[model samples]
Target: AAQTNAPWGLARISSTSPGTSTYYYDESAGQGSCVYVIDTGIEASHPEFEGRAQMVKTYYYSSRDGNGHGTHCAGTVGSRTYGVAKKTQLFGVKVLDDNGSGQYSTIIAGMDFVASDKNNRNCPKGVVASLSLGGGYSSSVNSAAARLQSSGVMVAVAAGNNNADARNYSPASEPSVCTVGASDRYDRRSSFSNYGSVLDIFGPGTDILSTWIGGSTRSISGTSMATPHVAGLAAYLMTLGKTTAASACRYIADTANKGDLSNIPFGTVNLLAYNNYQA
Candidate 1:
């Protein structure tokens, strides 16, 4: 990936410890799977995006990613320079505001957008929705996420940024998500990442470099950063014809690395998040 702008995350996946499940890079990449980032928004003009982005207007939010978080998340999902799936088409939804915050209802509406889009195959093939937000408990969020999965749309969510158990949160505790926790460069659970039974995977999040708003790049942290890495992988899986959520989940669990995690609270590390190095 030397000539590529998204090398960090790709190298980490291809050469780093407890790396990506299917070896390093698959030259075929994501094919046509849609990687939807349901958060602040995405910078479509960013050169890293390589013209593969689509902005979905859920409600009337700007979807401009005035805040950089969503851009960073999208980069890790499929930006060619800071991503895992180089060929998956990218999509964005603005749930959070420029202040880096959003209402519970706003988040649910984002999910609602994903639900309808998935059925329509709006991005073609399958869609992988990555959410890196958390705000306590919400049964509405839980049920929506579960139902989204049952509808064949794959969803990956943050296990919260606060260092605690994921069992106490909303979408993390939600029965049908790939709840992701954050890990350091060394594969140890990041100090701020939540853990416990609800965590599906622990992915690299500390000091990670990725796309920011305004067509630039920056390094950020939190499980939010980790969510997209897994989402990118799920998108890649979809390219291989694993179109259903259940199919993606089973394959991910079966091929995942155990990494160097020392405290995976659920007595297993099979389904936790994974990642790569510099882009």
Candidate 2:
């Protein structure tokens, strides 16, 4: 991989060896892709965004990101400083409250909105939705998310942080969604990250630094953090003509760094996220 100093999450995925501080990526960097941050909200004015981020809709009471989780996820997806697809267009769809919790109906509403928006051709080419939140399995929630992805928005969801089998969770458990698990700088699965056969990929999630509210940054951990990294990669793939959700998901899995992660549970895949960049 070509070398460039990068955030720990970015650096960890781009290189094969652990403890590397460099990230390799295509300079295209999702230039024509649109990513929907389906979470709390985004601080569009954050300097990390460079005016590329905006709150497009909110199922919550306000469009502001009081919890900071959504901003962090969005930053991981497309912020100029802490992003995977640095040139991507970011749209915030706030479904959670200030406490970073929300009802399933609210989240489904957000997904419906995204499906409709993509159908309307309002977003740029190569649409992707980053879902950094989830709970126990729910047929309705899974159905909604599936419909959204079927409508052409590539979806990347957290495999949850319960340290249990991810098959018990919705979105993550859903066969159609691109579920992501979390790994640390040492190339081991994070202790709290859920795992199982349903997981589609692993990403650097522990102690991840990304844009937060008030134009700042924060380091956090979870499958939530990991999901956006794959979401960003999906956007990057979309820019390269892997526009459909299924194709983007397949490309990511096919090109990922395999047999490099440790502490993986039984039935979990060993593939870690990677951008197909050459030195």
Candidate 3:
């Protein structure tokens, strides 16, 4: 039997009432912000995104309309109602086309474009590049991601969907980037989510709901979905006055629920604790 479920609704709530099931909130309103969604282009016509959507840039490095992975990932970060940073601008960089695959060189070019676009003043002060696609670790990819990080952009990558040590993944393993793992509706780590010392945070990933091509919706799963939740939160934290990438990272880790780690193999860390410490 085919499975049918609505997309996850974690990204649609107010920050004041971020439910136990939701990872974060859509708190980017009233702040002029932008995030570079280095994935597939959005549906551009979903009702949840009436007049509130904006795509500052678009690049198709791979085939068009493959499996909609990039589109789903984009929705998680900036797709109107279902997004974490709903009011921010989105730059859709199609690194992987319709086939859901692309060469390393093509992906690098997309990153370079986002990293070097200086003339676009509307672009966010720091780009939150959401990458939902990743495989094994690569030194070259790590180096390139490091360069992007040094250039003032925060690179957030999926810690791979395979239930293995995330420290072995390429860009995720890179110390300079922020690696994200997946959690299910129960706020428990997904069975397929990779874990290790390298993982910086976990977000809602399993059965995530997001905009699909042609004004539709769907439910998907993977660390890919979880990665954008962090990306969107990064943008929201920026709007809350944490402008730098490091500060945003700290804010998230500090605000997260460390209690969630009690049952897991690791001790959980929370961002709210750090925020209180700063006070």
Candidate 4:
């Protein structure tokens, strides 16, 4: 089926055309899958979620979303309106603060929590993590993300917005995580999106509209925005039997559209994420 009046990112992945306005997806694709948005926090009450979003754990002092980044990422990951996987259970794992900044240790704490959660344990085969945050190289952060993926959660991370080699970034540089870069509406690499051999693929990220704090919507751009689209697709794939992190990540790369994106850096793969929808 096709979704009308949809966000460009959603529509882009479902079709080969660059500017299509309709998104094709299985209405029940993510019914039994789960995606964890590890960032600031999500506004669980936002109508876009329709009761499917929840703040399961927070390293931050408050459970609410002060910075809208996490909510927006959650919307891209699984909100009914703008998500890639509309029916997946959305869990908010807060590590950053109200300013959308956090130490590596704080992010690790959140990852450890999600890696050991009972829900994740129960549904290990259908679990995925959307990590739309990154910084300079850190072994601890890289190790933590690897450990989380090893725990059976598919991990998708941002390649960073530095416009430099993704190798300079932590989890993005980690070979065990699926590092994503940003592509625009025209299938061109976003000017500020980090790139290099470490990036596994690109996803629609420029000028993205998604849910925000206080029951609103906002448009933003970053590799942060691109990461969740793949995360959502990973969850959607999980429901279709791409269970483990390794399997889901491989399927995501294997199913991408090659030679479609523009301005791809020398070592970075020229792959754009696709949702296997034939129309």
Question: Which model is ahead, 1 or 4, in terms of TM-score?
Answer: 4
Candidate 3: RMSD to truth: 5.5
The lDDT leader among the candidates is 4
Q: Comparing candidate 2 with candidate 4, which one achieves the higher lDDT?
A: 4
lDDT of 3: 0.65
- Sort order, TM-score high to low: 4, 2, 1, 3
User: Candidate 2, residues 14-111: lDDT per residue as tens digits?
Assistant: 77778877778888888888999999999899988998888889876789999899999999999877899998999989999999999999999999
The RMSD (Cα, Å) of candidate 1 is 3.6
Question: Which candidate wins on TM-score?
Answer: 4
What tens digits encode model 3's per-residue C-alpha lDDT throughout 213-246?
7777788889898888888777766766665665
Q: Candidate 3, TM-score vs. the true structure?
A: 0.82
lDDT by residue (tens digit), candidate 4, 1-279: 788989999999898769889989977758788888999999999999999988999886798889999999999999888999998888888899999899999899889899898353445348889999989999999999999988878899999999899898899999988999999999999999999988888999999999998999999999999999999998887776655566777787888888999898677899888988754
Better of 2 and 3 by TM-score: 2
RMSD of each: 3.6, 1.5, 5.5, 1.4
Residue 246 lDDT in model 3? 57
lDDT of each: 0.74, 0.88, 0.65, 0.89
Candidate 2 clash total? 0
Q: How many clashes show up per model?
A: 16, 0, 16, 0
User: How good is model 1 by TM-score?
Assistant: 0.88
